[PDB]
Amino acid sequence: STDNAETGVIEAGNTDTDFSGELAAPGSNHTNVKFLFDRSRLLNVIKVLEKDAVFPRPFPTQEGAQQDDGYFCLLTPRPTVASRPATRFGLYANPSGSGVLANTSLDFNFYSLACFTYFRSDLEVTVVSLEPDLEFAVGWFPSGSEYQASSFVYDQLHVPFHFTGRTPRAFASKGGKVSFVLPWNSVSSVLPVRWGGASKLSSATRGLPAHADWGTIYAFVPRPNEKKSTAVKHVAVYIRYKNARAWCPSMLPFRSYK
Amino acid sequence: STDNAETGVIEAGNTDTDFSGELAAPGSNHTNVKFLFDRSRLLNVIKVLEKDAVFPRPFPTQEGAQQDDGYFCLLTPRPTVASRPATRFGLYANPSGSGVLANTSLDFNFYSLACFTYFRSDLEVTVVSLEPDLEFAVGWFPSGSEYQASSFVYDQLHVPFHFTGRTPRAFASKGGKVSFVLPWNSVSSVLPVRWGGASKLSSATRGLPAHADWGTIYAFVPRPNEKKSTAVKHVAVYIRYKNARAWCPSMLPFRSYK
Amino acid sequence: DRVTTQTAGNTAINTQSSLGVLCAYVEDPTKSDPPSSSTDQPTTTFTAIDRWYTGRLNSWTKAVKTFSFQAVPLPGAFLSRQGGLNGGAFTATLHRHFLMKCGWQVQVQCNLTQFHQGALLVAMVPETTLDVKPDGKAKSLQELNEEQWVEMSDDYRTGKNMPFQSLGTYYRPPNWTWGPNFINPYQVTVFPHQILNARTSTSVDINVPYIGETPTQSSETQNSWTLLVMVLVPLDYKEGATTDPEITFSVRPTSPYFNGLRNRYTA
Amino acid sequence: DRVTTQTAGNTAINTQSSLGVLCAYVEDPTKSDPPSSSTDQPTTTFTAIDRWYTGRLNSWTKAVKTFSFQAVPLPGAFLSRQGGLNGGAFTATLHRHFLMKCGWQVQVQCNLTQFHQGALLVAMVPETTLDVKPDGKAKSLQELNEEQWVEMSDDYRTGKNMPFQSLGTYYRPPNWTWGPNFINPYQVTVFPHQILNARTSTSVDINVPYIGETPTQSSETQNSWTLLVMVLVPLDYKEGATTDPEITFSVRPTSPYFNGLRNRYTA
Amino acid sequence: TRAITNSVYSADGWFSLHKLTKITLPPDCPQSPCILFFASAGEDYTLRLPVDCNPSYVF
Amino acid sequence: RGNNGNMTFNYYANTYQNSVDFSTSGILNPLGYLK
Amino acid sequence: RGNNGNMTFNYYANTYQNSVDFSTSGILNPLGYLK
């Protein structure tokens, strides 16, 4: 069918448009955005806390900072680094040495189907243990709050301040899991998948949204600091995007030909 | 009663047809196809995965292929070999030596009552562990998909890519079971019990249906590859044919007189 | 009563000892709807493929044992030209269409006399690889014309010798014992059959509809039916009688729906 | 206004400088009744012969003089495959039917530029032997591809060289001077024609019905039409322009009525 | 939607842009013009069965 | 209905539990008719 | 409705399960219009 594609709008035609044929039946609705993003996937593998940690200091962190890394899961499909929102995703090709290997995360299953710019949904976090018989718990603090980092001596036991709070501290059973659904808490109307504005928190980094997150979870162990174990235990954070809505179509990542 | 059986149709008569008698009562409906196939039975005994395996390469597999066998249960009453659909069923009479003893499977309870050619049903897979206190999980990938065979380093732990996906990865409890019902997913309208056409995937093997399956399950252990155990643990796959329909009557297997 | 002339197109065939058309699985197997797996306009029947294609089949001596069968693949016989069964305008249309969805209507003629005994079991057998050698290769006409009647061994009763993918040199080659494309020779009467007896008829009449795992199957691969002539009682006669009675067969495709037009099939 | 896409079957052809279909001798040359000289049921059109069969024709240099024609026999081009004009399902149906009664619908494409001059006279010429050498033999493709454009001598203007029965050695062989299958080259515009000018169009459109001395003619003998491409003005261009413009043609048989089915024609 | 095993180089056939007549350019015009290809879905193109993606875009 | 005794209550719907066919546009009848 | 097969019964309310927007005061339409 004779067209002009310089116009920018092409009417999607069928076989009957040029030839003799008919329309096929509608297959299914598995491309529905509220249906397609509504399934769980691995987000980040964070180490389980055992003491009242220091939250990671803001960038640029200098050496001699006695902070606690690899502990907080900033719940976001966008690339993160050191439990803080980043712009580039970077893994370690040859991690020999040298400093602190920063925990990065990315939602691999999201950006392959995030052909849009803005995305709003609830979040259903399931925190699966990666340790046999682990009796852990799961904190949370919203987009814009900060970690309460101290302890209080309860009967000569340094019970930390992340055992309590007005935010959900879900306690897992022995060998169980933690599953709860978090609302869209951030101050932005939508989470920018791609962002081009500047956040003026620092020397203004272009393309870094400051409040594109559902918060930040952290696993801990419900014992005081005297009962701190030795081997560092992990946990695995599965998230699901409940009630997904997506705006403003955009690009999919570049599949290299090599 | 005087008849002609060369006609090919014989009216099934009663005692009253030749003699003096009466019709017996209707006994029951346990010959109903939707009722008779709706019961579980052992299909295949597959070994539980512990690392990100290589799926078995297509036939003819040559030596030096470092693939992982005996791991995938192609969910099908038809004869399988090496987790791939076969035409003949072959056990090992004297398995001494010599190469890799290929895992074969057959539904013994089906073909003794598969007096038909085409068969469509849902499938209710129950994966019973054959190991005490085994904490396993059960994957699946549909008829036409393929195994996602790699790993991603999550906090210096080689977590495989078969922990996630858009297909059901049901996680069993410790000492529990996994039971779920799979729809008729294959691209054929019905599963051919007996097939005579040629699949043109290879040099065309006659009688080999390429997409006569409900998919392929695989058991794994929810630990990363560093926590790989030594003793190879098994699991047992029980399937049930929910909502069975069967067409085109055919033959039952030959009971030998010896 | 028993004189039925079955006109189709320009080829009418006659039978004066007709038992009756064994219409299979339905009342009228001619009635069929177009395939639902083709968005293009299908090539329906036309007046040069609605006729009785007839070719010979091998003779039936006294040396033929019980259950020695003889299989005609449909549409495998139109393409390999088994028995001289040349399709003509049907095969020249079957080679150029990718998918083909038809139902068959066969008739096997073997006129015995009143002084002969014997019985064939003509039966349209669905989905069997009885035409294929166990090594994968389909039979050629030089190979059919040397065995003449493929005897019922235990490799056919068990399905031990159906064609297979060789596992390769990696896997240990397993002892094959069974395959679902067997013949249980005592249960071939479940299929759409008539018995070609030496004392009731000379010709049998079977009419089967399209069956298949897909709503239409490929043209060059399918063997959805198989005209199976099986000897239930061996031929016996006193000497002087007409030795080796001929067997023919006449095949008519009822309502075919071709799809996917392309050039002539070159493997 | 001038963008006409002529869909037929599964082969739609396009032209963006269309002058209009020159429907010949009637309003609608598609409408035709079955032959009255066949008591058998005729094979009408079907959806694999209702399409635009397209083959090339020779190039048009500057060396081509005025009135150098080039003739396409219809249906003589489907059978000899002149210019690659392969009929496919039409020729495979034309060889098997003894009589054939169709009307044609042609279109000749030769895209000049606005800086070229020249004019072809495409004209469906009825009942001419322009494809035949004077010695009786019809031309083969090796013979067409050496002259490329059969020049208008006085043997064609007088019809001196049309094919003939040799009288033998008994009669004195007479001085032949004339024959009715001449070309008067100045009067080819009485035929159903359009002029393929270098400044009005790239394609011409002619639609002719079935004509013939009998209500249907034989299949292997007839030359009832002849797609005649005649050069009225020689091609001229300044140097640098696209030398030797191609000429194709697209032929569609409108409503054929085949008769007399037999096996494939073997002379 | 993915030629995993096998489709030999032949899954649903081949698109092929043949040129019918040569492109007749006037003098003082660029040789070798460029046909820009797109690929859109039809008004009846419908998808089914999500799977895990290919995460090799990030490497 | 098959081997299903849960006569009262279906928690999941029809299209989730079973798998219904998509549209396109007792009495034991014999499997072969003499005509 | 999304990937939600629990057609019958919602235990928690709307504003607890979901997160409704606060007020201020199929049919696939195209994402770009030639005007």
Tokens of A251: 């690009």
Identify the three-state secondary structure at position B166: coil
Tokens of A165: 């709070």
| Cα separation values, D115 from D62, D109, D110, E26, Å | 14, 18, 14, 8
Strands C117-124 and C193-197: antiparallel
Q: Among partner residues C179, C183, C223, which is closest to B89 by beta-carbon distance? A: C179
| Cα separation values, A141 from A148, A211, E21, Å | 9, 13, 69
Beta bridge mates, B178: B127
Distance CA C110, CA C246 (A): 6
Contacts of B163 in chain A (CB under 8 A): 42
For residue G9, the chain F residue with the least C-alpha distance is F11
| Cα separation values, C169 from B58, B59, B79, Å | 12, 10, 20
How close D207 gets to chain E, by Cα (Å)?
A: 23
Thinking of the domain D1-267, which architecture would CATH place it in?
Sandwich (2.60)
| Cα separation values, A230 from A50, A51, D238, Å | 9, 12, 92
Alpha carbon of residue D131 to chain centroid: 10
How close F30 gets to chain G, by Cα (Å)?
A: 41
Experimental method: cryo-EM
Strands A80-81 and D4-6: unpaired
Q: What CATH number has the domain bearing residue B115?
A: 2.60.120.20
**What number of helices (H) and strands (E) belong to chain C?**
4, 13
Q: What is the DSSP letter of D255?
A: E
Strands D117-124 and F32-34: unpaired
Distance CA B231, CA A202 (A): 55
Strands B80-81 and B104-105: antiparallel
Residue-wise DSSP of B29-68: -TT-HHHHS-S-EEEEEEEPB-S-PPPPPPSSPPTT----
Q: Among partner residues G3, G4, G32, which is closest to A8 by beta-carbon distance? A: G32
The torsion angles phi and psi of A35, rounded to 5 degrees, stand at -95, -35
Sheet holding A137-138, edge to edge: A72-74, A216-220, A137-138, A170-171
Are the C-beta atoms of residues B76 and B114 closer than 8 Å to each other? no
Strands C117-124 and D117-124: unpaired
Alpha carbon of residue B17 to chain centroid: 45
Number of domains in chain B: 1
Say yes or no: F5 contacts chain C, CB-CB below 8 A. no
Picking from D43, D55, D149, the residue whose alpha carbon sits closest to that of residue D99 is D43
Please work out, in degrees rounded to the nearest 5, the angle formed at the alpha carbon of residue D26 by the alpha carbons of D24 and D31.
105
Distance CA A230, CA A50 (A): 9
Range of the domain at B173: 1-258
Are the C-beta atoms of residues A53 and A225 closer than 8 Å to each other? no
Picking from B108, B129, B104, the residue whose alpha carbon sits closest to that of residue B41 is B108
Are the C-beta atoms of residues C161 and C100 closer than 8 Å to each other? no
Interacting residues of C32 by C-beta distance below 8 A, sequence separation 6+: C101, C103, C209, C210, C254, C255, C257
Q: What is the CA radius of gyration of chain E?
A: 19
Distance CA C60, CA C198 (A): 12
Contacts of D261 in chain C (CB under 8 A): 10, 48
Q: What is the DSSP letter of A91?
A: -
Distance CA A9, CA C74 (A): 51
CB contact under 8 A, B166 and A103: no
Please work out, in degrees rounded to the nearest 5, the angle formed at the alpha carbon of residue A82 by the alpha carbons of A76 and A84.
45
Picking from C126, C136, C143, the residue whose alpha carbon sits closest to that of residue C213 is C126
Distance CA C105, CA D61 (A): 60
**CA-based max dimension of chain G:** 48
The torsion angles phi and psi of D207, rounded to 5 degrees, stand at -135, 110
CB contact under 8 A, A46 and B155: yes
Distance CA D230, CA D156 (A): 13
Distance CA B243, CA D166 (A): 84
Residue-wise DSSP of G2-30: -S----S--SS-HHHHS-PPPP-------
Distance CA D10, CA C132 (A): 38
Q: What is the CA radius of gyration of chain B?
A: 22
CA dihedral D31, D36, D38, D40 (to 10 degrees): 70
Measure the N-to-C terminal CA separation of chain D; round to a whole number of Å: 49
Are the C-beta atoms of residues B235 and B46 closer than 8 Å to each other? yes
Contacts of C20 in chain F (CB under 8 A): 34-35
Q: What is the DSSP letter of C180?
A: T
Beta bridge mates, C108: C204, C249
Are the C-beta atoms of residues D67 and D233 closer than 8 Å to each other? no
Distance CA B173, CA D96 (A): 73
Q: Which of E2, E7, E49 to mutate to test the interface with B (most CBs of B within 10 A)?
A: E49
Contacts of E22 in chain D (CB under 8 A): 242, 246
Distance CA D243, CA C45 (A): 50
Say yes or no: C27 contacts chain F, CB-CB below 8 A. yes
Q: What is the DSSP letter of A162?
A: G
Q: Do chains E and F touch (3 or more CB pairs under 8 A)?
A: no
Residue-wise DSSP of C195-237: EEETTT-SEEEEE-----SSSSEETTT---EEEEEEEEEEEE-
> Is the alpha carbon torsion for F7, F9, F11, F16 positive or negative?
positive
Distance CA C105, CA C88 (A): 17
Chains that touch C (3 or more CB pairs under 8 A): A, B, D, F
Strands C203-207 and A116-120: unpaired
Are the C-beta atoms of residues D2 and D14 closer than 8 Å to each other? no
Distance CA E11, CA E34 (A): 28
Distance CA D195, CA E40 (A): 41
Contacts of B194 in chain C (CB under 8 A): 126-128, 180-181
Distance CA G12, CA G6 (A): 13
B-contacting residues of F 6-35, CB under 8 Å?
17-19, 30-34
Are the C-beta atoms of residues C167 and C175 closer than 8 Å to each other? no
For residue D10, the chain A residue with the least C-alpha distance is A19
The torsion angles phi and psi of A125, rounded to 5 degrees, stand at -90, 125
Identify the three-state secondary structure at position D254: strand
| Cα separation values, C126 from B163, C34, D256, Å | 43, 21, 40
Q: What letter represents residue A167's amino acid?
A: T
Residue-wise DSSP of D16-30: SS----EE-SSS-TT
Distance CA D222, CA D24 (A): 20
